[PDB]
Symmetry: D3
């Protein structure tokens, strides 16, 4: 019955934890890694499944791309009792030796977004819940993935805010010119688009959140991710996030 997600509290069957990928197509994939996956609804960028993990209900809900739709999903799920949010995403590596297929667990986000400011002023840290970050690190490491813990630059755009130049105008606004090297020099691991919003919103709202993402491109090489390695990277990331969910449930 929530405005956008089209699900009710009853639909969630007691779920207090959500796995929130960006891509609607990833929802079923994640759900099927758990028990009794059930399709709930799909409207706009929000595809929602429920499943069971060690006897506990878990909701899987896509967020779409971007802080704005992410913020809607988190809010509406929180309205229905969800308190823990595990983003599983795709990401571009900023550092040269973070490779495609590696997993990145965000310890803090550079807030290159707008939606985070709708929850807390810029000085507030876009930081994950410590339990979630711990669970994500553990799940990733236990899985045998190559895992990096660190800061993520989280941008409201895919193109200029991640300093991509292979674009229609080929221009990047002054603020973002040279930004990728600046973040690289500052030890920032990766770019994605939703963690600043997610982490700030949750950390300032009594919700627990984290972000783990599979590296699909190394930005020291090129701007557009290769298709060939997307599926395997995604499969690894969802294995990891489901295990992180297990760790959060008990």
């Amino acid at each position: 019955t929530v405005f956008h997600l089209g699900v009710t509290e009853a639909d969630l069957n007691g779920a207090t934890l959500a796995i929130i990928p960006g891509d609607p197509a990833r929802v079923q994939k994640i759900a099927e890694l758990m028990d009794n996956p059930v399709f709930l609804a799909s409207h706009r960028e929000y595809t929602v499944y429920r499943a069971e993990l060690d006897g506990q209900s878990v909701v899987v809900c896509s967020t779409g791309i971007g802080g704005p739709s992410t913020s809607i999903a988190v809010e509406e799920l929180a309205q229905l009792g969800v308190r823990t949010f595990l983003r599983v995403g795709t990401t571009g590596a900023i550092q040269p030796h973070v490779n495609v297929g590696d997993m990145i667990v965000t310890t803090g986000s550079v807030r290159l977004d707008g939606a985070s400011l709708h929850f807390a002023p810029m000085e507030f840290p876009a930081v994950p819940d410590f339990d979630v970050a711990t669970a994500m690190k553990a799940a990733a490491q236990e899985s045998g993935a190559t895992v990096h813990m660190g800061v993520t630059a989280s941008s409201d755009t895919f193109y200029p805010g991640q300093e991509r130049y292979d674009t229609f105008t080929g221009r990047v606004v002054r603020r973002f010119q040279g930004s990728m090297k600046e973040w690289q020099d500052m030890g920032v691991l990766n770019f994605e688009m939703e963690s600043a919003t997610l982490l700030t919103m949750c950390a300032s709202s009594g919700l627990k959140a984290g972000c783990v993402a599979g590296v699909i491109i190394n930005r020291t090489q090129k701007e557009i991710p290769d298709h060939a390695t997307l599926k395997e990277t995604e499969a690894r990331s969802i294995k990891v996030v489901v295990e992180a969910a297990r760790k959060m449930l008990k």
Copy 2:
């Protein structure tokens, strides 16, 4: 070349230089069928893409999802493929008493309560539509018989606190947005939505033509609940209007 998110090529667009960009993927086919020879091109994520023909010219219809960030991707990727004019259509909630359900709003400028616009131009830059698009939208909206409002829209990266909604999980609105609705109301702002600041700033600073038209389906200031019929007519009218606005742009 296939663009990364939209999954279409320039050839797929058959020479289209104009796109109608609703937020909701499900509305794409509904818009396309108002035109000739609608063809599904792709659906990935919150991007459903059709092509159609309007007065013999190819037009793209592509959903953006909610929010500037995903909108910015659709606009960019379509621009790479030759699209130069972008018409946003949707429905919206008004914050002015004189704006009724069923009315149309054509955005003359947006309050940039978003983040993505800043990735194209600093905050000082105006989130303003192309004048031809705004003009075509006004004319199309008027020709539909609806009352049309030209004015400023507050474009928020959130549905909840940025639109000063308190009926939420925390019930809190960050300091920045406390009292903001009344502020915008007093400044004559017509409505809230969530994509126009990004769309208009991006396009106006990138040599792209953009505008936004929206049917009003609710009013924050009115207790009355619009009936099903009026809402349905408003949704249908909004897309008839945007298609007619596209026709005016292609003339």
Copy 3:
């Protein structure tokens, strides 16, 4: 009764609800004399005020001086006296190679490189004209036979560093404005001026209708000096155009 800076009363305006607001006090009489029965009302500081009649309706002509701050005083004080529509007229320097001397620019939005706009609305708010005024100005400008550009203007609180001029006493431009002309050019900005951001933001947030039209008398990217006749023609056209825009605005 008598407004403090302008030195006029509501009665002096003879029911005028529209003002034409050039920057230069010396231009006021010229504009007034394009209309019927021009009457000198007052001159104080940068504020020369005339009244005239256009199609039987009273119109105020009031100079603003250079800059948002003095403009904001004139607009406010005229608004206190019942003026609701403000038509900025002037001449301007373009920054786009395709914009030629003699062309007209009608502002669709302004880059807020000023301070006074912030005294009316936070930076996120668009410095946007009233749609009717912009439409009337476009129509008047097009009917003049001039080439007309609708687009964004960069509105600077300075003539020198904020317009990235280096031929100055210090030869320095603060970091904020270094490379800024090229940035605005690449963003499609048509010209620099010094009052529109304030005017448009103030009016758009205060229930007043405003717009700006300017004849192009120089182009920052061109080396040719326009001849005296061309400059005179352009000045004359700019004020003929604003008076015609006023005519179109009158009910």
Copy 4:
């Protein structure tokens, strides 16, 4: 070189390195005639320019109009022509109850509620006068029999909302400025005016010496619109003061 707005050459200034810069063009001749051999040089827009001699030294008197933007033009163009010291003589509103109409205030630093100052230095930079100028102004004020206050001035790009005036057309003051007058009062700020932030920042960051002395024509503890009755006397005192301050700078 003939400077663009002021219409004077360096030779016209007869070696003047100091300018007295009132806001009101009508005040220029009044200042000039307190000195020797006053000559009218030019009048264009809000810029009326005289030269005179003080203890055998050339001094320029040049109005700035109201606002940082027009002020910044005058200062720049005078600086191009060799002027290095700028003494603003203005009118001001006191925001401390103990200050009386007719008192003089010499600004020791300005709250930068303007836009033009940012075109010279980022906001962190202090809008501070040259210490010699401030010292000369204080001494000149005391020696002229004036009651003088030294302190911080809030320097606003608007007369109305940025000085938290409510007796206005809309009666609204943007969020930023709501409660601002009491906040500045609580912080010990003495007065409001409109040009000192721009003048002082521009000069302090450009190797020019500047100061601002202003006659208190209103106390905001009582009212928002200055009484007419005391304007002339206050102005006459202020110009006596500023000429003597100029004398002290030339010694």
Copy 5:
């Protein structure tokens, strides 16, 4: 090389790559003596520096003084001399009702209410500890039998207005900080202190590992000035914890 402020050389540190950095110079010896072979190295200004050995590895203990600025000097100079890991042990005021005097807080991120953090990274950058350090601090805290909280710390450049204390000389708090404590409380912020924003931002953007654990010496829901009675024992627990955290980092 002898670093400018700390007055120590790389050789003095005997290969230390980890520093414990309390704010209070008097706390340095107290920390060092929990380790093996503590040796005084230097004391200059707020910087008292000892070396000691923990499980055979050299560890530096260096006070920072109060504030990001002096902290930033200590961290930089220690980093020049090979230190890569920095463990702040401090005192803090809790702002959550459930947190008790004597509890420990391990900062998972800081609200950057400081200025020095901006000298290392723009405000968007998260003031976040190194994950290993935060992990080590939590475990150390738990293993000491103390009550520990993981969460966000508001890190202020002032003790008084930036922590919204009103029992002060002026009794005023600048607009920005009015209501700020409640705002942070509502956002789940655990405590106030003064150095973590600077420390964490500097380190996280400079390839250094940092964390902050602080003993709660006051709950701000109760009072503004910490009671003297519980200071010593709260300090004693905090330093036991930080030394054990160091042990875990060196393992």
Copy 6:
């Protein structure tokens, strides 16, 4: 009755209403001993506090530590105990070629490159000294025989990146501060230090009188190293000057 950090009471100050506030606790006794009957009051953290008598009036000497945050604490707590005038003394490095080692700088305004100033007044507020204090400091400095520079100081929350030092652990400086030294040099800024913005803004907005005077002990632009004797004389002169400035401030 006993302030939290300084560990002194009002009675301890013996009616002192003026404090000399060096940064270095070790310098406190030296300053106190220039006056009569110096008495040690307290030492805690970076705060060493003495009292002495100057022309029969009690004067406090209190170190502040490095940086605005610790300074703000000392000023506040002394103000709680009746201190109203604060004279910052120290030595500094100049960034202008014309400023020589041994010269004195009296700050007329500070560039607010700090955070703590914002906890007292928004950025637009000028970090300006009290005019009487600045006057007294200028007079004392000039009477010493030193060359005295009245001008703007850049007040940084860091010693390293905020003063654009590259000889550091990371060897880089955040974008904001890249090229900043040359920018301040070109804007006429005399020197960097680390406390004046906080001190001056706090005091000027809190009804306290403050100023800063410093002896120049090095010049960023000169490769020549001053000898021990010159540095010693400059250090000595700086504190003699501040004591004489105190004398001038007293009644």
